[PDB]
Amino acid sequence: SYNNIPAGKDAPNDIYVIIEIPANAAPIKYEIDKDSDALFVDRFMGTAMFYPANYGYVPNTLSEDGDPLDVLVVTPYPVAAGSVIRCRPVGKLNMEDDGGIDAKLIAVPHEKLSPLYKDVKEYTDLPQLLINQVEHFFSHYKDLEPGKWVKISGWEGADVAKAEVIKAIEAAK
Amino acid sequence: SYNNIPAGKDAPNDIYVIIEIPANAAPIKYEIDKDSDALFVDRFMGTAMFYPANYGYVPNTLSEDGDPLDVLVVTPYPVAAGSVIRCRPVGKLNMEDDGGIDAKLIAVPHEKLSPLYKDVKEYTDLPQLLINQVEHFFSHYKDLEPGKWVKISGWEGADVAKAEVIKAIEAAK
Amino acid sequence: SYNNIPAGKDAPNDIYVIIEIPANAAPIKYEIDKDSDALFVDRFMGTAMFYPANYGYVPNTLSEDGDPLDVLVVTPYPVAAGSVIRCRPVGKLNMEDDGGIDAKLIAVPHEKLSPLYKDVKEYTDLPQLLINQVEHFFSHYKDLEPGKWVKISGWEGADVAKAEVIKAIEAAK
Amino acid sequence: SYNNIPAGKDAPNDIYVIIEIPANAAPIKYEIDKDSDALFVDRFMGTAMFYPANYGYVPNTLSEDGDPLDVLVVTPYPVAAGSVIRCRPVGKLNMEDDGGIDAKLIAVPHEKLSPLYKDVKEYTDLPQLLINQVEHFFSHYKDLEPGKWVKISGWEGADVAKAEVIKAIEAAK
Amino acid sequence: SYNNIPAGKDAPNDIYVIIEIPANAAPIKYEIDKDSDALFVDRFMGTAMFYPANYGYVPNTLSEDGDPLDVLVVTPYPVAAGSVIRCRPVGKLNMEDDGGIDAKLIAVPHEKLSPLYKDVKEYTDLPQLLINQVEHFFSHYKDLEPGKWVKISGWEGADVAKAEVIKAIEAAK
Amino acid sequence: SYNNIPAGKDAPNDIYVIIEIPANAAPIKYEIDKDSDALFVDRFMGTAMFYPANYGYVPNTLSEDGDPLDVLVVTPYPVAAGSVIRCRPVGKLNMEDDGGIDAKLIAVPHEKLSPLYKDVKEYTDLPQLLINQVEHFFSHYKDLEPGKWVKISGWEGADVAKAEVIKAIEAAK
Ligand SMILES: [Mg+2]
Ligand SMILES: [Mg+2]
Ligand SMILES: [Mg+2]
Ligand SMILES: [Mg+2]
Ligand SMILES: [Mg+2]
Ligand SMILES: [Mg+2]
Ligand code: NA
Ligand code: NA
Ligand code: NA
Ligand code: NA
Ligand code: NA
Ligand code: NA
């Protein structure tokens, strides 16, 4: 089951992300049901938007919102919903919403999976337009869900994102 | 596992359906293998038809044919095979086949998932053409499987469909 | 060629729309090149958005912006880019942008093509969420194109939309 | 334009078919508008069916129904709508409908395009299930269009299909 | 879980294959993680190639390379990643690589799933071009993975492939 | 028609490419028929490969092989077959085949279409893996077409590619 997957083979530098929503997919928000391991349809998204990168969580972590830590994973082609990507954080996007504050990490595939991201050490090494798309997506994807808003605060770098992984790991135990 | 999912959060009005065949998909009939929870290919369909809505079953139910209770779930876009939709029955389609009688419920997503079906209380609140497509699909999708036929009997409403959910729940215990 | 297609078989009630961008498609903005009739890639869209309905124009019309009159056409499944839909206006969405003002009509397929929209006489007969998605899409799809903004003004009904078709037809001669 | 394409490089054995509806596609019936060469949406199909092979017509031919001669073309993967396949008839399917009688040829790609059909000389050299799917498709695809019915009469072979191509060619002049 | 699936309902003639990579899919190599049963992204493939048939393994088997026995399964349409096909071996492809030797079986769906392969008893009953595509795919798909090469040795028939299934079954206990 | 499209708005730095085969598409080789402007199926490709970038030609040019000059165009998402991309050459790939020598240019979208390639001035500014994929694709995509082989010679830069555009333009007059 998904519970058997460690937060990573090697901590913050070498982590696993279980993908719930593929990049470039239909506007269906899935979420792994923790009791059953099944992919639940959580929402048919209102806005006509798509996730600019694969979206999921690091197993065996806990964030402030009671869910595991959220991560976007950039890949050369979208991966299957429910599949698991070995990856490496390169940044952290901070935001405020209607329920306080939120954050999403961004990660790239481990070099065992692809050579394409060898030179991507910080989120600023990704295409500037991709970074803008991610900011714009999280700023607006809930605009048609009543009582929901999101304001983008700003980014922090790979080191701070990796620190967030470690904090979420300890928080889960 | 799928066995951990209850028939619903709240009985006949708020139920779960595990999707085996997405709407508008390739003509592959999948079926969840109960021993393993895996999606098995049960048949490469003979006819050049597709399911007009997502097709699956309510967990922890038992119908007359020894399988869990069958449900079609209407959604704004097809969901992933094996995913789980929180939904609400709005009708029941009765049929005769080569092995006696059969029935399929039709359901719409719970309001937590989408506002689009708030005003859909009965199957007659859905587009008349969709209802016709569903009747025509079940009437003909097995036409090229030898020894198989299906005749449509007629529809019953949301209340009777919900009664069928409760009967199938008790039958499973 | 596209120039041979009349604005419609029967004026404002029965019109043709040449689709440039299908509903639910990749974020590529095509535009028909009038000299060649070819589909040109006009822009790889910055935002992670998709058109909520098929987008195109009425041939042999002229709008204030020197291009033919713009129309969104709702269909049960997205149509091919460059294909031509016989349809009927049901509304007009007014907006302001960086270059003044703009408007988009919304239309449904002619009854010869589908019975699904027989009861859709006004844009308010469409799902309220679809209308919201259209407003939100045009409000934000150019957010990542520098120097571009759009503010939604409001909607007018089918009669006013049809009047716009007639005005654009006369303007083209 | 499509009018510039001959019925074939070499008569009945080596012909061109302009594809209007790809195999395995959404249930949208396109038709080439002869005045403009554009792909028109002719119908959003009622039944939940798909064409088992690519569907189109032989240019510069005329059938009894005032349209060019209809052909299904089997291919290893569906081709783009509006594209043109060099092919070779292998059979003719006869039917009765509400307007009298109808027929559809079936063809395979020319050996210049693929070696896969070298041994397919007659429609009976194709998979028996494919032939059944084609019969079942034409028998039922108009079941939800009011006042439409189709009854399958039977098949004739490659030679008779090729004779039909020649008759339709002469009929167009 | 996948571990609950037997190598087959009936040995070498009637076996199960868990599909990791669908036919005709994006160039993402998935692999089932045995500890968790989850689909892991193992590699974003370097070459611009796709698997000519569905790729996976027979559960409860063990090959020389410490992984379960590899099988390609031919189907009329690609199946979902992670789904399970009841099938029957028809051949065995032998190869040498950088780590010694390797082999892949090829199988067709059980007659309960489809009649299309009733007459396919040996791999030489499949289209010759498909067999060539499979040879060419395995010969070249790792060409852009550093230090990887594959040379095709040749094929053996259905009986030898079935013997390989039995050997791998005993090896797993 | 396509003949009305100039080789470019501004010569070698600002050119048009008519796409015949989209990136990441089914293995169908289309070719624009010059007499009719229609997209012809030229070949169902034997190898299980896909074009790593959109493939087409510069209108109103002539290469040594009697066809217009060939170009690969890199885009963030594949474009529709038959569509036209405003782009800019960044490199030239030289090869030998069974009929002597061949070459393919590689280009990126004009800045009016996307900001993503502003810093891509030479083919060596693209991902090294993409360049390898292109070399490997042309080296092997005809391996299963009898009597066809291709050997890669090497690359030249943007300036030489642009010189090739000018030579092909003059050659067409
Ligand atoms: Mg969260
Ligand atoms: Mg049942
Ligand atoms: Mg405009
Ligand atoms: Mg006809
Ligand atoms: Mg192996
Ligand atoms: Mg050439
Ligand atoms: Na809101
Ligand atoms: Na039957
Ligand atoms: Na802006
Ligand atoms: Na009828
Ligand atoms: Na290598
Ligand atoms: Na060869």
Author numbering:
A (entry chain A), B (entry chain A), C (entry chain A), D (entry chain A), E (entry chain A), F (entry chain A): 1 to 173
Q: Anything the authors wrote about it?
A:
However, because PPi is stable under normal conditions, inorganic pyrophosphatase (PPase) has evolved to specifically hydrolysis the molecule. Here, we solved four crystal structures of a family I type PPase from a strain of the pathogen Acinetobacter baumannii. The crystal structures of AbPPase showed that the enzyme has a typical Rossman fold domain that is highly conserved compared to other PPases. Family I PPases are hexamers formed by two stacks of trimers.
In Structure 1, we identified not only one Mg2+ (M1) bound to the catalytic center, but also a Na+ bound to a loop (residue 143–149) close to the catalytic center. The space group of Structure 1 is P6322, and there is only one AbPPase monomer in the asymmetric unit. This indicates that all monomeric AbPPases have the same structure. In AbPPase, β-ketone groups from two highly conserved residues, Lys143 and Lys149, coordinate with this Na+. Moreover, Pro147 forms the turn of that loop. Since this loop is close to the catalytic center, this Na+ might regulate hydrolysis activity by modifying the conformation of the loop. We found that the presence of Na+ could attenuate the hydrolytic activity of AbPPase. The elution profiles of AbPPase in these running buffers are the same, indicating that the inhibitory effects of Na+ occur via binding to the loop, rather than by altering the global structure of the enzyme. Structural and biochemical analysis of apo AbPPase shows that the binding of a Na+ ion to residues within a loop close to the catalytic center could inhibit the enzyme reaction.
